[PDB]
Design a binder for this molecule. Structure first.
Ligand SMILES: *[C@@H]1O[C@H](CO)[C@@H](O)[C@H](O)[C@H]1O[C@@H]1O[C@@H](C)[C@H](O)[C@@H](O)[C@H]1O
Ligand SMILES: *[C@@H]1O[C@H](CO)[C@@H](O)[C@H](O)[C@H]1O[C@@H]1O[C@@H](C)[C@H](O)[C@@H](O)[C@H]1O
Ligand SMILES: *[C@H]1C[C@](C)(N)[C@@H](O)[C@H](C)O1
Ligand SMILES: *[C@H]1C[C@](C)(N)[C@@H](O)[C@H](C)O1
Lengths: 7, 7
């Protein structure tokens, strides 16, 4: 992945 | 805080 969140 | 990231 690589991005983060949280959705 | 409470949200995430990463910026
Ligand atoms: C999310 O990333 C931060 C920044 O590096 C790290 O300190 C947290 O341990 C990390 O969260 C975990 O890992 C991710 C892969 C899971 O989605 C999240 O629930 C948590 O286990
Ligand atoms: C969230 O990411 C910060 C960096 O921005 C990292 O220093 C924290 O340890 C990380 O939080 C941990 O992981 C998340 C997923 C949890 O909600 C939090 O309680 C904490 O364990
Ligand atoms: C990460 C944190 C958040 C944005 N407050 C939550 O709504 C999500 C489900 O997880
Ligand atoms: C979180 C992940 C990211 C957007 N790939 C990175 O650029 C940032 C510094 O931390």
């Amino acid at each position: 992945x690589x991005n983060x969140x949280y959705x």
